[PDB]
Design a protein around this motif. Structure first.
Motif, PDB file in Angstrom:
ATOM      1  N   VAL A 245       0.854  -1.188   0.000  1.00  0.00           N
ATOM      2  CA  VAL A 245       0.000   0.000   0.000  1.00  0.00           C
ATOM      3  C   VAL A 245       0.887   1.233   0.000  1.00  0.00           C
ATOM      4  N   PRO A 246       0.711   2.093  -0.997  1.00  0.00           N
ATOM      5  CA  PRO A 246       1.508   3.319  -1.106  1.00  0.00           C
ATOM      6  C   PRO A 246       1.073   4.370  -0.091  1.00  0.00           C
TER       7      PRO A 246
ATOM      8  N   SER B 107       0.821   7.262  -0.095  1.00  0.00           N
ATOM      9  CA  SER B 107       0.187   8.448  -0.740  1.00  0.00           C
ATOM     10  C   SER B 107      -1.345   8.440  -0.662  1.00  0.00           C
ATOM     11  N   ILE B 108      -1.984   7.299  -0.438  1.00  0.00           N
ATOM     12  CA  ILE B 108      -3.474   7.287  -0.498  1.00  0.00           C
ATOM     13  C   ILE B 108      -4.018   7.026   0.913  1.00  0.00           C
ATOM     14  N   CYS B 109      -3.210   7.228   1.962  1.00  0.00           N
ATOM     15  CA  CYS B 109      -3.635   6.865   3.347  1.00  0.00           C
ATOM     16  C   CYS B 109      -4.174   8.057   4.153  1.00  0.00           C
ATOM     17  N   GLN B 110      -3.914   9.273   3.716  1.00  0.00           N
ATOM     18  CA  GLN B 110      -4.482  10.437   4.433  1.00  0.00           C
ATOM     19  C   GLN B 110      -3.952  10.515   5.829  1.00  0.00           C
TER      20      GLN B 110
END
Lengths: 212, 30, 229
Positions: free
Chosen positions: B12-13, B15-18
């Motif tokens: 999981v990158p 960048s998309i976890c907020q």
């Protein structure tokens, strides 16, 4: 394992009334639910995401409501343009789509125009004869098409296909194809196609004699 | 089966976890 | 405006590998925080998602297909591709490419907006056959009022699909192209009909343009009234 169910599978709706559609989950999906519109032969289109949020560019007549296990998409003031299949898709763990609901339009009954076509001479070179009979621009979809050669009725040698409900005038068209062999196409002389339907007061018969 | 499977992802990158805390436990900065 | 276009073989022999490419235009894939994916729909079944790929090389997998999916992104030609191994008839489908918005923030995003138009893949043990195109000739028996019906019959082709236009795209009003039916021979057959003002029958030329891509067959058949004798 999450399971998306939709009801009803299909729905006929007068032009203008409000179609309300339902999606259901086995376990809960909170509000991780989107709705797509898919007109036939065109690309799917995202209507609602968030389970209440219209995507940009979508008319206000489309609205999503619900949560956990029960969601409802509703189309107020339904247009004829709106004929399509609507899929829900949950995204609580990963993308899962519902089976979809087909939204049909209702309209006044419309009798078909019936046309008949003898086989091409080019095709008779090859050893087969395809007779085509066509019902054009009728409603509703149900129509009986019986073939008759020399007033002999046939069975098992015909096939039909119906068009998608026309997105403009909400009608249907159908073609029946009676396939015979060059030899027996010549052993008989009258080819007739009898049509029975709700727009006709009595059945109607288009026929032609071989070679006029 | 619900609540974010990250096993399905290869990784999981970040960048998309907020700000999600559980996402920032498995995420990987690029 | 953002657009996606699939391209790939209409026909793939079983026990082999199916490969498709999406060409995104009107927006760049890199740099971009969006995943890029493929969804498929078998004939008469629901939509199934397959896999998505992010500019970073992260890959989001539908677990029931993971073992068979290879998905890649060529950031320079603005292209992501899908390779599905060991295909069976269960893999015959319309394959769509889409933009996959994944987000784990306050309001999750995990949906597909926008989508391509699909491409039909067919997993068949057979060989491609191009259609034979025959005219559905106007007659006194194909007229009603001042309108006349004429068409052409696209027969014995495999696999789907054929596209049919009329007069090189000039005529698109009154056109009805029917869904192909499967014949007993194992091949498809279709028929495209148009209704036109019968006053124009001997003066306007009506040509139907058939294109069966999976065999590079293109046919143009002029449709005149059948010798009436």
């Amino acid at each position: 394992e999450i399971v998306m169910t939709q009801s009803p599978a299909t729905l006929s709706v007068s032009p203008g009334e409000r179609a309300t559609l339902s999606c259901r989950a086995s376990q809960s999906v909170n509000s991780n639910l989107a709705w797509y519109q898919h007109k036939p032969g065109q690309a799917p289109r995202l209507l609602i995401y968030g389970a209440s949020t219209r995507a940009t560019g979508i008319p206000a007549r489309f609205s999503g409501s619900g949560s956990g296990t029960d969601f409802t998409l509703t189309i107020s003031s339904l247009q004829s343009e709106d004929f399509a299949v609507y899929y829900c898709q949950q995204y609580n763990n990963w993308p899962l789509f519902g089976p979809g609901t087909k939204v049909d339009l209702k309209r006044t009954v419309a009798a078909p125009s019936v046309f008949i076509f003898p086989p091409s001479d080019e095709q008779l070179k090859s050893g087969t004869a395809s007779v085509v009979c066509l019902l054009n621009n009728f409603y509703p979809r149900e129509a009986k098409v019986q073939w008759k050669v020399d007033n002999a009725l046939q069975s098992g040698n015909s096939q039909e296909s119906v068009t998608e409900q026309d997105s403009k005038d909400s009608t249907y068209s159908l073609s029946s194809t009676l396939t015979l062999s060059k030899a027996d196409y010549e052993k008989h002389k009258v080819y007739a196609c009898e049509v029975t339907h709700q727009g006709l007061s009595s059945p109607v018969t288009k026929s032609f004699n071989r070679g006029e | 089966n619900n609540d974010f499977h990250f096993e399905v992802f290869n990784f999981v990158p970040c960048s998309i976890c907020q700000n999600n805390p559980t996402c920032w436990a498995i995420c990987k900065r690029i | 405006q953002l657009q996606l276009q699939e391209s790939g073989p209409g026909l793939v022999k079983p026990s082999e590998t199916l490969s498709l490419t999406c060409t995104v235009s009107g927006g760049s894939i890199s740099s971009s925080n969006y995943y890029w994916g493929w969804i498929r729909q078998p004939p008469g079944k629901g939509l199934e998602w397959i896999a998505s790929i992010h500019d970073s090389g992260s890959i989001y997998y539908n677990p029931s297909l993971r073992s068979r999916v290879t998905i890649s992104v060529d950031t320079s030609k603005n292209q992501f591709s899908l390779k599905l191994s060991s295909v069976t008839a269960a893999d015959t489908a319309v394959y769509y490419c889409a933009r996959h918005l994944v987000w784990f923030g306050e309001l999750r995003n995990n949906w597909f907006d926008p989508w391509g138009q699909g491409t039909l893949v067919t997993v068949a043990s057979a060989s491609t056959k191009g259609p034979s195109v025959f005219p559905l000739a106007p007659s006194s028996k194909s007229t009603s009022g001042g309108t006349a019906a004429l068409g052409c019959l696209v027969k014995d082709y495999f696999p789907e699909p054929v596209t049919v236009s009329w007069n090189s795209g000039a005529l698109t009003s009154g056109v009805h192209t029917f869904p192909a039916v499967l014949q007993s021979s194992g091949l498809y057959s279709l028929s495209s009909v148009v209704t036109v003002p019968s006053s124009s029958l001997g003066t306007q030329t009506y040509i139907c343009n058939v294109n069966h891509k999976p065999s590079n067959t293109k046919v143009d058949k002029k449709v005149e009234p059948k010798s009436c004798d």
